[PDB]
Amino acid sequence: EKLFTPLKVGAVTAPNRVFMAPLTRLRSIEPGDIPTPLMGEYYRQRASAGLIISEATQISAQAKGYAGAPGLHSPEQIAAWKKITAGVHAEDGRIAVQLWHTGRISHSSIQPGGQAPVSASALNANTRTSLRDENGNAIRVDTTTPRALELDEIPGIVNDFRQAVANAREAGFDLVELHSAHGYLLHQFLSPSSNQRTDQYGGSVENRARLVLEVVDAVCNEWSADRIGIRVSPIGTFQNVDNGPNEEADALYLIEELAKRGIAYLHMSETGKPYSEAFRQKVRERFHGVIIGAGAYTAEKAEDLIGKGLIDAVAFGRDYIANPDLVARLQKKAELNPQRPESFYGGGAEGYTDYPSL
Ligand SMILES: NC(=O)c1ccc[n+]([C@@H]2O[C@H](COP(=O)([O-])OP(=O)(O)OC[C@H]3O[C@@H](n4cnc5c(N)ncnc54)[C@H](O)[C@@H]3O)[C@@H](O)[C@H]2O)c1
Numbered sequence: 001e002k003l004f005t006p007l008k009v010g011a012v013t014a015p016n017r018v019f020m021a022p023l024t025r026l027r028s029i030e031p032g033d034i035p036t037p038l039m040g041e042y043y044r045q046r047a048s049a050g051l052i053i054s055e056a057t058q059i060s061a062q063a064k065g066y067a068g069a070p071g072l073h074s075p076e077q078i079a080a081w082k083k084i085t086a087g088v089h090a091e092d093g094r095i096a097v098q099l100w101h102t103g104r105i106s107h108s109s110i111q112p113g114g115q116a117p118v119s120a121s122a123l124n125a126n127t128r129t130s131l132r133d134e135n136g137n138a139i140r141v142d143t144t145t146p147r148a149l150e151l152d153e154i155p156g157i158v159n160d161f162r163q164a165v166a167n168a169r170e171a172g173f174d175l176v177e178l179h180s181a182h183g184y185l186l187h188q189f190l191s192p193s194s195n196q197r198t199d200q201y202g203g204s205v206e207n208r209a210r211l212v213l214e215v216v217d218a219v220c221n222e223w224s225a226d227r228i229g230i231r232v233s234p235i236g237t238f239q240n241v242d243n244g245p246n247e248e249a250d251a252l253y254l255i256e257e258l259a260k261r262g263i264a265y266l267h268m269s270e271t272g273k274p275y276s277e278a279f280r281q282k283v284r285e286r287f288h289g290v291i292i293g294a295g296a297y298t299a300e301k302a303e304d305l306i307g308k309g310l311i312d313a314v315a316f317g318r319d320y321i322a323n324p325d326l327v328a329r330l331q332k333k334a335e336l337n338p339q340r341p342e343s344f345y346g347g348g349a350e351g352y353t354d355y356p357s358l
C-alpha cells in the first residue's frame, strides 16, 4: 500500500517511505577518521532507499568516541565523503549525514591529547564504546569518566555543529540529521540522569533542552530548516541514559519547540515499553513536519502507523545492513538475507558489501 508512495522531506523528495537508518559500522581509516570507497560501495548498494541516513559522523575530533567512526571536520574527510555522496547521486539516491558529538560515550585514549571526554556533568556513562586493538579489530571497552563542560565552552560546541553542517553541504549530502538521541552529547544534556548542571544549561526541562535548541537555530541559519532533521529517543532508556521522571511531557516540550523552527523532520528512535497511540497522536499534533519512526519496525507495523497518519516513514536498521535492495524485497514480499551481527562493527567488506540483492 502506502509504504511505496513518494514523500517530500524538506529539500528532497523520497520515491518511497523505506529509509535506511543511521548505522555505525566502524570501517573508517585511522588516523584521520576517513570514509573509504568501500563505504562508498556500501551506500551506493542501498541507494534505492527512499532516504539514506549515514552512520553517526563526528562534528569534530573532540566528538570522537569510537575507533573507526568517520568525521566531517577535515578536508581529507570532506573530499572522501564527496565521492560517496556523488556515488549515491549517480544511482539516483538521497543521503543525509547524521552528525554527533559522543560526549561521555568515548575513551580518553582516542581523544585529542589523551584527555577526558566532555559532557554536561562529570558522570560515567557506565557503558561501553567500541575501540580497536593492535590488529585493528573492534573491541568493547569501558567508557572514560567525562569532564563537565565549562559554561564558556558551549558556544564552541554550537559552532562545531554549524561548521560540520557547512561541511555537509560542501560534501554533497542532501540533509543533515542532528544526533540528539541514544545518550550522546545532546541527549546527555537533555536527560536529568546525566545532566546535573546548576547553570542555565541544567535543571528545568527548558534548561536541559537549551543546548539542543541553540544547535537547531545555528544550523537553520547556517543552511536551512528544510535541510535539518533531528533524531530523538525521548521515551525509555538508551545506553544507560533514561529520560527522567516526566519523559512524556518533556518530550512534548522539546517537540513543540522543534516545531517552531519548522525543520524538515522528526526521527523518533524507539525501543521496554511501546509508544501509546495517545502519545503518538500528541506528537503528530505538535509537530507539522515529516515524522520518521524506527526501532524494531516491520513493513506491516509501518504500513499501519502510516495509514493511521501517525508517522510518514520508517527507517530500518538491521534489515538494511543485510538487504541492499530492501525496498524491492518489501514490495515483492521476498525473504530477507540472514543477518550477520558478528560483523556489524569493524572489519572490511565481509558482512558489509557482500550481502546479495534479489
Ligand atoms: N551511533 C549510535 O547511535 C549507536 C551505536 C551503537 C548502537 N546503538 C544502539 O544502541 C543499542 C545498544 O546496542 P549494544 O549492543 O551496544 O548494547 P548491548 O551490548 O548492551 O546489547 C547487546 C545485546 O545483544 C547481544 N549481543 C551483543 N554483543 C554480542 C556478542 N558479541 N555475542 C553474542 N551476543 C551479543 C547480547 O544478548 C546483548 O544483550 C543498539 O541496539 C543500537 O540500537 C547506537
Ligand SMILES: Cc1cc2nc3c(=O)[nH]c(=O)nc-3n(C[C@H](O)[C@H](O)[C@H](O)COP(=O)(O)O)c2cc1C
Pocket (backbone or CB within 6 Å): 021, 022, 023, 024, 025, 054, 055, 056, 098, 179, 181, 182, 231, 269, 294, 295, 296, 297, 315, 316, 317, 318, 319, 344, 345
Ligand atoms: C549496528 C548498529 C549501529 C547503529 N548505529 C546508529 C547510529 O550511528 N546512530 C543512530 O542514531 N542509531 C544507530 N543505530 C540504531 C539504528 O539507527 C536503528 O534505529 C535500529 O537499528 C532500528 O532497529 P531495527 O534494526 O530493528 O530496524 C544502530 C543500530 C545498530 C544495530
